[PDB]
Design an enzyme around this catalytic site. Sequence first.
Site, short mmCIF file in Angstrom:
data_model
loop_
_atom_site.label_atom_id
_atom_site.label_comp_id
_atom_site.label_asym_id
_atom_site.label_seq_id
_atom_site.Cartn_x
_atom_site.Cartn_y
_atom_site.Cartn_z
N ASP A 37 0.80 -1.20 -0.11
CA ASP A 37 0.01 -0.08 -0.22
C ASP A 37 0.84 1.19 0.04
OD1 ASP A 37 -2.03 1.94 0.30
OD2 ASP A 37 -2.79 1.53 2.18
N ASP A 242 -1.15 5.18 -5.63
CA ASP A 242 -1.62 4.56 -4.65
C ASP A 242 -1.87 3.15 -4.79
OD1 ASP A 242 -2.81 3.44 -2.21
OD2 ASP A 242 -4.52 4.73 -2.14
C1 LIG Z 1 -6.99 3.44 -0.86
N1 LIG Z 1 -6.85 3.04 0.37
C2 LIG Z 1 -5.27 2.85 0.83
N2 LIG Z 1 -4.78 3.20 -0.14
N3 LIG Z 1 -5.32 1.93 1.69
C3 LIG Z 1 -6.32 1.21 2.80
C4 LIG Z 1 -6.47 0.09 2.46
C5 LIG Z 1 -5.96 -0.43 1.32
C6 LIG Z 1 -6.33 -2.01 1.13
F1 LIG Z 1 -5.91 -2.37 -0.06
C7 LIG Z 1 -7.15 -2.50 1.73
C8 LIG Z 1 -7.76 -1.92 3.04
C9 LIG Z 1 -7.21 -0.77 3.16
F2 LIG Z 1 -8.11 -0.01 4.33
C10 LIG Z 1 -5.73 1.80 4.37
N4 LIG Z 1 -5.84 3.07 4.53
C11 LIG Z 1 -5.33 4.07 5.36
N5 LIG Z 1 -5.25 5.34 4.93
C12 LIG Z 1 -4.32 6.07 5.50
C13 LIG Z 1 -3.50 5.77 6.54
C14 LIG Z 1 -3.60 4.64 6.92
C15 LIG Z 1 -4.26 3.63 6.51
C16 LIG Z 1 -4.60 2.19 7.15
C17 LIG Z 1 -5.66 1.83 7.55
C18 LIG Z 1 -5.99 0.38 8.14
C19 LIG Z 1 -4.65 -0.06 8.30
CL1 LIG Z 1 -4.65 -1.66 9.33
C20 LIG Z 1 -3.59 0.28 7.86
C21 LIG Z 1 -3.46 1.33 7.34
C22 LIG Z 1 -6.94 3.56 3.47
C23 LIG Z 1 -7.42 2.34 2.86
C24 LIG Z 1 -7.99 3.03 1.47
O1 LIG Z 1 -8.67 2.89 1.09
#
Ligand SMILES: CN1C(=N)N[C@@]2(c3cc(F)ccc3F)CN(c3ncccc3-c3ccc(Cl)cc3)C[C@H]2C1=O
Length: 405
Positions: A37, A242
């Site tokens: 990520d 992202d």
């Molecule tokens: C687009 N997108 C990301 N690019 N990533 C996230 C994510 C990616 C994924 F592949 C599956 C589930 C997801 F939650 C994690 N996110 C965070 N956004 C900002 C800061 C921290 C987090 C985060 C949230 C929860 C955890 Cl344990 C670790 C980190 C936001 C969320 C999201 O929507």
Amino acid sequence: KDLLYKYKLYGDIDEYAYYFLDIDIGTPEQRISLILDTGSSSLSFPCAGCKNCGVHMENPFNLNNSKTSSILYCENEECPFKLNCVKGKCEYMQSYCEGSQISGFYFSDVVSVVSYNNERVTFRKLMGCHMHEESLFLYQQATGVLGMSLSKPQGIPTFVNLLFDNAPQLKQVFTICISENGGELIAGGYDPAYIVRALREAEKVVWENVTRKYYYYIKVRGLDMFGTNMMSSSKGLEMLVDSGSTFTHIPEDLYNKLNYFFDILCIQDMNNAYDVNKRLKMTNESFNNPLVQFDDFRKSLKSIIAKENMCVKIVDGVQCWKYLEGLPDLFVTLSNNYKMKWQPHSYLYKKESFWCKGIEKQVNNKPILGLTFFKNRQVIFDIQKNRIGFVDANCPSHPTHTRPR
Ligand SMILES: CN1C(=N)N[C@@]2(c3cc(F)ccc3F)CN(c3ncccc3-c3ccc(Cl)cc3)C[C@H]2C1=O
Ligand SMILES: *[C@@H]1O[C@H](CO)[C@@H](O[C@@H]2O[C@H](CO)[C@@H](O)[C@H](O)[C@H]2NC(C)=O)[C@H](O)[C@H]1NC(C)=O
Ligand SMILES: *[C@@H]1O[C@H](CO)[C@@H](O)[C@H](O)[C@H]1NC(C)=O
Ligand SMILES: *[C@@H]1O[C@H](CO)[C@@H](O)[C@H](O)[C@H]1NC(C)=O
């Protein structure tokens, strides 16, 4: 001949909706699958004792079985890194959505990254133990999240900075090469052998400066369909690069303009005269936004019809076509008026036998170049020079059944 360390990625757009890799944590090693990520900065996963965690591909990390684990307790209620003290421990708290959180506590332990050529990098990392999961984390297969963004001053040192700090034999560059099934993470550079061979211009990396110090934003200056800029009202747009976003997310006006034309190109039944006639009757004047290359719109429409490239609409009106052939390239305008080709084999993704649109509306003014922009290119994060590079590539492909254990 820069030294490259390579790591297998597994996943896809439709079934997993992310790509993940295996990392070894603790002593002895506990192997954990982590979502790759670039949109986040933490390393976290459920730990043994969690009372509301999903079942993932691995058991929760067991602290009591790692001799090198160290929980971050509060010393007279004071935590480092401006963290909050909750019930004696320094709290881990993340909002996966604008308003909802995964929570737990912080601990440190040894992390070991091993390339598939058996090249090992090891260091200690401050990581999050999930003690409460919810929403999509209760049904995601991957066990945790590996955030790939940069360290900030006075913040927790992130994985990417620790990896390169502990591998001085590598140049401070990592590359993500997403295919339809699986992919590869490269540390130390990009691999020119993966590059697809005017035409010489497309074999060369295109670089864009990152517009923020510690997050992977670049400025998009236009988006063309059939030679027509569909966001002409906006002349710079910071978009996050992202790998943790399944789809590419764009402003609402731009989405509606693109989707208008994708709807026209989506024909359910090539033998329904009313449906076909309505589309073939459209002229340049039929459109709210006239096209600069109306003849290219006509060539796309006619070839979709002639090749019986049938389209099915799935949940939420997402279009899915039988074939990639006939769909138009989109073009992302970058610096110096450069037009970066965005092909159907990237912005459409494989779903059963069809190819479905992987472009969506942004929410909360958060535009994202997501996995349907990464797909079938090398995306090159040069953290030394604070730039991101793009080049079309034949990325390694790894089915999930090839993943050991
Ligand atoms: C687009 N997108 C990301 N690019 N990533 C996230 C994510 C990616 C994924 F592949 C599956 C589930 C997801 F939650 C994690 N996110 C965070 N956004 C900002 C800061 C921290 C987090 C985060 C949230 C929860 C955890 Cl344990 C670790 C980190 C936001 C969320 C999201 O929507
Ligand atoms: C992208 O960033 C680089 C690095 O800052 C810019 O190149 C610098 O340009 C200034 C003035 O033009 C020079 O004084 C520096 O020596 C350059 N740095 C390097 C490393 O060469 C570049 O101009 C930026 N690109 C755009 C389109 O703004
Ligand atoms: C780990 O051991 C400690 C002390 O022996 C105990 O308090 C804790 O509950 C154990 N954790 C788990 C998940 O069993
Ligand atoms: C369609 O109309 C637009 C109006 O801006 C024009 O630029 C374009 O050349 C026209 N194309 C035709 C008539 O094929």
